[PDB]
Each structure stands twice: as C-alpha cells, then as structure tokens.
Amino acid sequence: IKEMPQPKTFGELKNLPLLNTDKPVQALMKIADELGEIFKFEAPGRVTRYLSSQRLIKEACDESRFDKNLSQALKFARDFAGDGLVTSWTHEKNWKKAHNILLPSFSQQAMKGYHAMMVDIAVQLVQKWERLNADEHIEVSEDMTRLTLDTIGLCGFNYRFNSFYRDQPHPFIISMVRALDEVMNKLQRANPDDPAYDENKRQFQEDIKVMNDLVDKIIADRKARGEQSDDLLTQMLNGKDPETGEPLDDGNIRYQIITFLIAGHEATSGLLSFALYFLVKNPHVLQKVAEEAARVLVDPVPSYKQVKQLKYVGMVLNEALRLWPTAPAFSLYAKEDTVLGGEYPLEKGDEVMVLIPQLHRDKTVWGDDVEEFRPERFENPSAIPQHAFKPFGNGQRASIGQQFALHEATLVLGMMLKHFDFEDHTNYELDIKETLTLKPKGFVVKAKSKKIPL
C-alpha cells in the first residue's frame, strides 16, 4: 500500500554516513523523530528497516512470522563470542542446546542461591563509598561496572575480579571495550573487509586473545577448586540436553563464558547509572524510594525475601529501562513473505530492527507525558499493552538474564538509598555514551553517608 520513508542518501554510500557519529543509536532516534513509525536504512550490502511504533513492533514480535536476526553488530561479535547464546541463530544446534542446559540457572529460585553472592559485592561497593573522603566523589558508571562485573564473575563462574581492589580498570575490561568498539566501528566502514583495516583487525585479534587468556584462566581456577558450585560454569560443563542427550562442546563452552562475561555486567551497569541518574533529577521520586528502602531493608544485610519486597524500586528501574533501554535495539527477519501494518511489503528474510527507545516514547500507548520520569506508570502493570515495552527483547530469544539483572539491581539500588543521601554536585547535564549498549558518560555525584552499619 505505502512506500517506506528513507533519510538522506549519498550516492553509492546510500545512508551509511548518516551514522558517522560516536552516538549512532541517538542519531537513529532523531531520524525516527523526523520520519515516523518506520523507515528504510540502506548501507552498502545491507538494508534494514527501523520500527518505532507499538503498532508495527506488535506484529514483528509475533514469532510465527519473525525470528531473531543477527544485526550487523552481532555478525561481527561472532568473532569472539562465537555461537554462544547471544550471537547464534535459533536454527543453530548450540542455541537450543545452550538454551535448555542454562535456562535452569535463571529461574527465580536460582536467584535464591545467587543472593548471598550478590550481597558480597553489594557490600563491597557500599563500603567503598562510606570510605571516601569529603571532596572525593563517585564516578557512577565506572563503579556500577565494577559491581556488575564482579557479580557475573563471582556468581557465574565463582571468580573474583576484585574490581573494587582496583582504581586502574581491569585487563579484561580494557580489551573487552576495544573489541566492543571495533565492532561498533566496523559498522560505519563501508567496505569493512580490506586494509587499512588490518591494523585494526590485528588490534581486534590481540584483544580476543586477551579475553581468551582470562577464559583460559577461569577454566583453570575451577580445576584447582574443591569444585562444588551449582554455578553456570558447572552447569555448562556437566549438563546434558533433555531434548538431545549430549553435553556442550568445549569450544562452545568458551564462547558462552565470554558471552556471559560481556552480557552479564554490560547492560546492568547502564540501567543502574540511568536509575541513579533519574533519582538525582527527580528528588520527589528519590524520597519515595529512600523511604521504601529504609522501611523494607530492616536487617543489617538484605535477605532474598526482602529484595522481592522492594515493589517501587522495581518501578523506578523499569522506568529507567523505559527511557533508556541499555540494550537499545534488536533485529528480526521475515520468516516468510508478508505485509507489516497492512501497509509495508516485506520479502522472506528481510531484516527489521526494533528501536526500543523510540518504542518506549510512543504516545498512542504511554500518554503524551513520555519524556517525563514517572514510575507510577508501572502500578497496574496489566496497563502496558502487548509489546509496548521491551528492554529485554522478545519471546524465546529474550534476555535469559532478566530475573538476574533485575534482582541484582533492585538489591543494589536498594542498599545505596538505605545508606546514602545523594548530591548531583556538578549539575550533570546528561551525556549518553554508546558502545553497543548505552550508559551515562561522566555522571558524577557526591554521597552523604547516613551512618547506617552493615
């Protein structure tokens, strides 16, 4: 019925140079603001459409019709993350395998086990902060990465990164980032396969080794342990497939460790920053949360029962996830020829790309008060129409990490607010940094301790 809009083009460079910025996802957000609920984005060799309406995304999330696609980002990350859970097709052997063997360690009862371990890390950060001098401050995104990377480490593989013991960032993180930059960077390189890009290839290739250096070291610390863990490394190593009958390959085992080491802390870092960013800008909300935290968290350290009982802290996080989904995009492909919206024709295997932040700012569904931070939006959570809100993605290919991140971050956001008054001491104008995921760049706060003992 209708042709699909398309932003400015540059001859054979098609759209590519529109996203020649350090802030792509946000440029994509502007174009979606100019062009509307869907638009064609062509780059040499790839074409993909970006959806922003709950109308369209509604259909796209329908699995009978669309399956998960590897966006050009994931097809590049396959270089280090192989065919782990995140970067593999539903149709590959190791997905459904990996899926059944690992899903168990993510039930809200596996949570129960992970709690003490989360607390371990949560106290480490709380103490880091009680121990700062006046005139010292808190570099927020840096600290959250410390925490969330210590947790996926300690819980996932029983491995202390001892992130707090360090003021120079961790030898694994450094490389991880260059990697997750070379990825974010090959994208905007029209012919990504020739050199000049051989200096970069080698830089990439020298980071993969460094990661695998650590993956090798983690396999080795499990060996010299009086191994006991229920932890997901144990699961991977010894588990078998109900569906199939076999255990996972060793090369696949490596890929998943990297996958869980990256996905594990990356997304949940941002969401905390963003959460805490919003609390310092919306001090009414802050005092509401302050209140809940002190009322519920009565024992010196929180028990699992208590964290599930932080109902409003859950809403603030969802609302932070609403405005700034830290994993802001996912792709899907036309299983069959079809017509999205009764309006837009697509052919088999045509790629489309849910643009979460714009889906999360869709008036016909949320209200006209979209840019505003109001958690109360989450009270009757029946309210959200089907597929209005998707920080965690869709159907069978959604974040297996949902319960976990959310438990984690509830617990941590819980404790900070029990323990500290906060001051945006510089009047931080928001600066979103984009690796694959989003997070506040240079967010800094002071923290007046409320002298409550742990």
- Residues of this chain that bind ligand HEM (CB under 6 A): 68, 85-86, 99, 259-260, 263-264, 267-268, 271, 326-327, 330, 391-393, 397-401, 404-405
Beta carbon of residue 167, minimum distance to ligand HEM (angstroms, whole number): 25
Please count the other Cβ atoms lying within 10 Å of the Cβ belonging to residue 176: 24
DSSP single-letter state for residue 335 = S
Alpha helices by DSSP H, 225-310? 232-238, 250-281, 283-296, 304-308
Beta carbon of residue 394, minimum distance to ligand HEM (angstroms, whole number): 7
State how far the Cα of 25 lies from the Cα of 242, in Å rounded to an integer.
40
Beta carbon of residue 207, minimum distance to ligand HEM (angstroms, whole number): 20
User: In 119-150, which positions are buried (b, 16+ CB within 10 angstroms) versus exposed (e)?
Assistant: bebbebbbebbbeeeeeeebebbbbbbbbbbb
Tokens found for residue 153: 């480490």
Pairing, β 329-334 against β 66-68: antiparallel
Which lies closer to ligand HEM via its Cβ, residue 138 or residue 400?
Answer: 400
State how far the Cα of 311 lies from the Cα of 435, in Å rounded to an integer.
31
Which lies closer to ligand HEM via its Cβ, residue 99 or residue 374?
Answer: 99
Which residue's C-beta sits nearest to ligand HEM?
401
Which lies closer to ligand HEM via its Cβ, residue 344 or residue 392?
Answer: 392
Beta carbon of residue 113, minimum distance to ligand HEM (angstroms, whole number): 14
Which lies closer to ligand HEM via its Cβ, residue 7 or residue 59?
Answer: 59
Backbone φ and ψ for 415, nearest 5 degrees, come out as -65, -45
Beta carbon of residue 325, minimum distance to ligand HEM (angstroms, whole number): 6
Please count the other Cβ atoms lying within 10 Å of the Cβ belonging to residue 47: 14
Output the furthest CA–CA distance in the chain (Å, rounded). 65
Q: Give the chain's count of helices (H) and strands (E).
A: 16, 12
- DSSP for 148-166 reads HHHHIIIIIS-----GGG-
DSSP single-letter state for residue 13 = G
Tokens found for residue 103: 């899903």
Beta carbon of residue 201, minimum distance to ligand HEM (angstroms, whole number): 25
State how far the Cα of 98 lies from the Cα of 256, in Å rounded to an integer.
8
Beta carbon of residue 186, minimum distance to ligand HEM (angstroms, whole number): 18
Pair 407, 114: CB distance under 8 Å: yes
Backbone φ and ψ for 126, nearest 5 degrees, come out as -60, -35
Nearest CA among 325, 407, 395 for reference residue 362: 325
Which lies closer to ligand HEM via its Cβ, residue 175 or residue 318?
Answer: 318
Beta carbon of residue 330, minimum distance to ligand HEM (angstroms, whole number): 4
Which lies closer to ligand HEM via its Cβ, residue 236 or residue 263?
Answer: 263
Beta carbon of residue 421, minimum distance to ligand HEM (angstroms, whole number): 26
Using DSSP's 3-state secondary structure scheme, residue 127 falls into helix
Pair 324, 22: CB distance under 8 Å: no
State how far the Cα of 436 lies from the Cα of 24, in Å rounded to an integer.
10
Beta carbon of residue 8, minimum distance to ligand HEM (angstroms, whole number): 28
Amino acid letter for position 102: L
Beta carbon of residue 428, minimum distance to ligand HEM (angstroms, whole number): 22
Which lies closer to ligand HEM via its Cβ, residue 265 or residue 288?
Answer: 265
Which lies closer to ligand HEM via its Cβ, residue 72 or residue 282?
Answer: 72
Which lies closer to ligand HEM via its Cβ, residue 65 or residue 446?
Answer: 65
Number of residues assigned to the chain: 454
Which lies closer to ligand HEM via its Cβ, residue 15 or residue 72?
Answer: 72
Q: What's the distance, CA 49 to chain centroid?
A: 22
Which lies closer to ligand HEM via its Cβ, residue 263 or residue 296?
Answer: 263
